[PDB]
Amino acid sequence: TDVLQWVLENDYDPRLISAMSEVRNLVEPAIARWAAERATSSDLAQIESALNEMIANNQDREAFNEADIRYHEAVLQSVHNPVLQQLSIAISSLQRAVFEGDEANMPQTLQEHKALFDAIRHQDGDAAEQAALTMIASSTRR
Amino acid sequence: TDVLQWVLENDYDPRLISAMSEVRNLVEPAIARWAAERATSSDLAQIESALNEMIANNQDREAFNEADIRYHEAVLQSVHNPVLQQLSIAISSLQRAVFEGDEANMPQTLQEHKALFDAIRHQDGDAAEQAALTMIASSTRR
Ligand SMILES: [Zn+2]
Ligand SMILES: [Zn+2]
Structure with missing residues (x-):
């Protein structure tokens, strides 16, 4: 009853998944490389803080997603x-x-x-690009 | 009296120009490479048609921009x-x-x-990527 259901294959739409993965593999590894090239230590402190919150709050699927x-x-x-x-x-x-x-x-x-x-x-x-690519591949494998 | 004027340097805002150029140099050369890899001859006919219209109608700055x-x-x-x-x-x-x-x-x-x-x-x-990069650089040089 929603048009999205009518134009997308339910559960697994391979063409949209490939289009999304192509866009993500273009944009997010570049973001990662530029972060590696430009982040300051104050930027690093904000990333590290959120990483530690993810590590600590990996139990309730709301405080973790908030930290992700x-x-x-x-x-x-x-x-x-x-x-x-x-x-x-x-x-x-x-x-x-x-x-x-x-x-x-x-x-x-x-x-x-x-x-x-x-x-x-x-x-x-290079390592930041590879880490981003790995994350996108793991997100896709679900 | 429009906030954009208040937050952007008038005529020439170098930081926005650099941000825009970075985004364009990421996205549009990739589009060009994928077009070179994926365009069919029917795709080529649509591009070539618009190119010929640009060539023919380069006199009035409305039919050319329409063809661009x-x-x-x-x-x-x-x-x-x-x-x-x-x-x-x-x-x-x-x-x-x-x-x-x-x-x-x-x-x-x-x-x-x-x-x-x-x-x-x-x-x-490679040539499509280079052509896109040249176009972005020429757009920026204005
Ligand atoms: Zn995440
Ligand atoms: Zn153009």
Whole structure:
């Protein structure tokens, strides 16, 4: 009764998934590389704080998701590009408004966010790109 | 009396120009490469048609701009990614709603669109990327 159901294959729409994954693999690894190149230690403190909150509050699926949002928001802010920031917010809003436990991959999820933070702190653009790509692939594999 | 004037340096805002150029250099060369990789001959016919209309109607600054829009729209459609298409449309709308003769660089503009079309037809992703980058640099140099 909603047109989205009429134009998208239910549960698994491969073409939309591929379009989304292509856009994410373009934009988010670039964000990660620019964060590694531009984040200051005050930016790092905001990312690390949200990472620690994710680690600590991985039990209730509301305080963790609240801390996951702050992590990506701190990563995005460390790029210091308001246009890119709005674009990535639009991409993430579309992803959550179209796509459908999360505890079953909680250990892998925390490790991926730690690896992205470590690459950003190390100012390693290649490692940050790889961490972002891994996160997108793990998000897609669900 | 409009807040945009209050938060942006008039005529030339270097930080917004750099943010815009970074976003465009990320997204539009990728669009160009994917067009070179994915466009069909029916896609090529739509791009070539708009290119010829630009060439023919380069005199009145309304039929040319009408044909310039159709060129970029045909390039975008040849990528066959609706998410990327909406993102690039949002970027282009922001560019025209924020930024300010065009005959003085008409010859260079037509040559750049011809070079992008040639790269797309040749399915040369590197050449299409370079043509897009050149177009963005020439747009910025104004
Ligand atoms: Zn996350
Ligand atoms: Zn043009």
